[PDB]
Coordinates of all heavy atoms in Angstrom, one line a residue:
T1 N 0.8 -1.2 0.0 CA 0.0 0.0 0.0 C 0.8 1.3 0.0 O 1.9 1.3 0.6 CB -1.0 0.0 1.2 OG1 -0.3 0.3 2.4 CG2 -1.7 -1.3 1.3
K2 N 0.4 2.3 -0.7 CA 1.0 3.7 -0.7 C 0.6 4.4 0.5 O -0.5 4.6 0.9 CB 0.5 4.5 -1.9 CG 0.6 3.9 -3.3 CD 2.1 3.8 -3.7 CE 2.1 3.0 -5.1 NZ 3.2 3.5 -5.9
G3 N 1.7 4.9 1.3 CA 1.5 5.5 2.5 C 1.4 4.5 3.7 O 1.2 3.3 3.5
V4 N 1.7 5.1 4.9 CA 1.6 4.3 6.1 C 0.1 4.4 6.6 O -0.3 5.4 7.2 CB 2.6 4.8 7.2 CG1 2.7 3.7 8.4 CG2 4.0 5.0 6.7
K5 N -0.6 3.4 6.2 CA -2.0 3.3 6.7 C -2.1 3.2 8.2 O -1.1 2.7 8.9 CB -2.8 2.2 6.0 CG -2.7 2.2 4.5 CD -3.1 3.5 3.8 CE -3.0 3.3 2.3 NZ -3.4 4.5 1.5
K6 N -3.2 3.6 8.8 CA -3.5 3.5 10.2 C -3.2 2.1 10.8 O -2.5 2.0 11.7 CB -5.0 3.8 10.3 CG -5.5 4.1 11.7 CD -5.3 5.6 12.1 CE -5.5 5.9 13.5 NZ -6.8 5.3 14.0
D7 N -3.8 1.1 10.1 CA -3.7 -0.3 10.6 C -2.3 -0.9 10.4 O -2.0 -2.0 10.8 CB -4.8 -1.1 9.9 CG -4.6 -1.3 8.4 OD1 -4.6 -0.2 7.7 OD2 -4.4 -2.4 7.9
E8 N -1.4 -0.2 9.7 CA -0.1 -0.7 9.4 C 1.0 -0.3 10.4 O 2.1 -0.9 10.4 CB 0.4 -0.3 8.0 CG -0.5 -1.0 6.9 CD -0.4 -0.3 5.6 OE1 0.5 0.5 5.3 OE2 -1.3 -0.6 4.7
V9 N 0.7 0.8 11.2 CA 1.7 1.3 12.1 C 2.1 0.2 13.1 O 3.2 -0.1 13.2 CB 1.1 2.6 12.9 CG1 1.9 2.9 14.2 CG2 1.1 3.8 12.0
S10 N 1.1 -0.5 13.7 CA 1.3 -1.6 14.5 C 2.3 -2.7 13.9 O 3.1 -3.2 14.6 CB 0.0 -2.2 15.0 OG -0.7 -2.9 13.9
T11 N 2.1 -3.0 12.6 CA 3.0 -4.0 12.0 C 4.5 -3.7 11.9 O 5.3 -4.5 12.3 CB 2.5 -4.2 10.5 OG1 1.1 -4.6 10.5 CG2 3.3 -5.3 9.8
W12 N 4.8 -2.5 11.4 CA 6.1 -2.0 11.3 C 6.8 -1.9 12.6 O 7.9 -2.4 12.8 CB 6.0 -0.5 10.7 CG 5.7 -0.5 9.2 CD1 4.6 0.0 8.6 CD2 6.5 -1.1 8.2 NE1 4.7 -0.1 7.2 CE2 5.9 -0.9 7.0 CE3 7.7 -1.8 8.2 CZ2 6.5 -1.3 5.8 CZ3 8.3 -2.2 7.1 CH2 7.7 -1.9 5.8
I13 N 6.1 -1.3 13.6 CA 6.7 -1.1 15.0 C 6.9 -2.5 15.7 O 7.9 -2.7 16.2 CB 5.8 -0.2 15.8 CG1 5.7 1.2 15.1 CG2 6.3 -0.1 17.3 CD1 7.0 1.8 14.8
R14 N 5.9 -3.4 15.6 CA 6.0 -4.7 16.3 C 7.2 -5.5 15.7 O 7.9 -6.0 16.5 CB 4.7 -5.5 16.2 CG 4.8 -6.9 16.8 CD 3.5 -7.8 16.6 NE 3.2 -8.0 15.3 CZ 2.2 -7.4 14.6 NH1 1.6 -6.4 15.1 NH2 1.9 -7.7 13.3
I15 N 7.3 -5.6 14.4 CA 8.4 -6.3 13.8 C 9.8 -5.7 14.2 O 10.6 -6.3 14.8 CB 8.3 -6.5 12.3 CG1 7.0 -7.4 12.0 CG2 9.6 -7.0 11.6 CD1 6.5 -7.3 10.5
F16 N 9.9 -4.4 13.8 CA 11.2 -3.8 13.9 C 11.7 -3.4 15.3 O 12.9 -3.4 15.6 CB 11.3 -2.5 12.9 CG 11.3 -3.0 11.5 CD1 10.2 -3.4 10.8 CD2 12.6 -3.0 10.8 CE1 10.2 -3.8 9.5 CE2 12.6 -3.4 9.5 CZ 11.4 -3.9 8.8
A17 N 10.7 -3.2 16.2 CA 11.0 -2.9 17.6 C 11.0 -4.1 18.5 O 11.7 -4.1 19.5 CB 10.0 -1.8 18.2
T18 N 10.2 -5.2 18.2 CA 10.1 -6.3 19.2 C 10.6 -7.7 18.8 O 10.8 -8.6 19.7 CB 8.6 -6.6 19.7 OG1 7.9 -7.4 18.8 CG2 7.9 -5.2 20.0
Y19 N 10.9 -8.0 17.5 CA 11.6 -9.2 17.1 C 13.0 -9.4 17.6 O 13.8 -8.4 17.7 CB 11.7 -9.3 15.6 CG 10.5 -10.0 14.9 CD1 9.2 -9.6 15.3 CD2 10.7 -10.9 13.8 CE1 8.1 -10.2 14.6 CE2 9.6 -11.5 13.2 CZ 8.3 -11.1 13.6 OH 7.2 -11.7 13.0
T20 N 13.4 -10.6 18.0 CA 14.8 -10.9 18.2 C 15.5 -11.0 16.9 O 14.9 -11.2 15.8 CB 15.0 -12.3 18.9 OG1 14.4 -13.3 18.0 CG2 14.2 -12.4 20.2
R21 N 16.8 -10.9 17.0 CA 17.7 -11.0 15.8 C 17.5 -12.3 15.0 O 17.4 -12.3 13.8 CB 19.2 -11.0 16.3 CG 20.1 -11.2 15.1 CD 21.5 -10.7 15.3 NE 21.6 -9.2 15.4 CZ 21.8 -8.6 16.5 NH1 22.0 -9.3 17.6 NH2 22.0 -7.3 16.5
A22 N 17.3 -13.4 15.8 CA 17.1 -14.8 15.2 C 15.8 -14.8 14.4 O 15.8 -15.2 13.2 CB 17.1 -15.9 16.3
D23 N 14.7 -14.3 15.0 CA 13.5 -14.3 14.3 C 13.4 -13.3 13.2 O 12.9 -13.6 12.1 CB 12.4 -14.0 15.3 CG 12.0 -15.1 16.3 OD1 12.5 -16.3 16.1 OD2 11.3 -14.9 17.3
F24 N 14.1 -12.2 13.4 CA 14.2 -11.2 12.3 C 14.9 -11.8 11.1 O 14.5 -11.6 9.9 CB 14.8 -9.9 12.7 CG 14.6 -8.8 11.7 CD1 13.4 -8.1 11.7 CD2 15.6 -8.4 10.8 CE1 13.2 -7.0 10.8 CE2 15.3 -7.4 9.8 CZ 14.1 -6.7 9.8
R25 N 16.0 -12.4 11.3 CA 16.7 -13.1 10.2 C 15.9 -14.1 9.5 O 15.9 -14.3 8.3 CB 18.1 -13.6 10.7 CG 19.1 -12.5 11.0 CD 20.3 -13.0 11.7 NE 21.0 -14.1 10.8 CZ 21.7 -13.8 9.7 NH1 21.9 -12.6 9.3 NH2 22.1 -14.8 9.0
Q26 N 15.1 -14.9 10.3 CA 14.2 -15.9 9.8 C 13.1 -15.2 8.9 O 12.9 -15.7 7.8 CB 13.4 -16.7 10.8 CG 12.7 -17.9 10.3 CD 12.0 -18.7 11.4 OE1 12.5 -18.7 12.5 NE2 10.9 -19.4 11.0
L27 N 12.5 -14.1 9.4 CA 11.4 -13.4 8.6 C 12.0 -12.8 7.3 O 11.3 -13.0 6.2 CB 10.8 -12.3 9.5 CG 9.7 -11.5 8.9 CD1 8.4 -12.4 8.9 CD2 9.4 -10.3 9.6
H28 N 13.2 -12.2 7.4 CA 13.9 -11.8 6.2 C 14.0 -12.9 5.1 O 13.6 -12.6 4.0 CB 15.3 -11.4 6.7 CG 16.2 -10.6 5.8 ND1 17.0 -11.3 4.8 CD2 16.5 -9.3 5.6 CE1 17.7 -10.4 4.1 NE2 17.4 -9.2 4.6

């Protein structure tokens, strides 16, 4: 989607702020 929609703020913040390195590398 174009722009940071309302319902997307939670997604970005949860992944980038709360994932461990291991899980982040897995998601990547």
Side-chain angles (χ1 to χ4, degrees):
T1 74
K2 305 291 174 148
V4 191
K5 311 301 181 178
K6 197 86 189 309
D7 66 300
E8 293 160 19
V9 164
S10 68
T11 303
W12 284 120
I13 301 305
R14 176 184 65 261
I15 292 163
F16 288 76
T18 85
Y19 272 44
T20 61
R21 179 161 291 106
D23 286 349
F24 195 81
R25 290 170 57 76
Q26 191 176 335
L27 185 75
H28 189 275

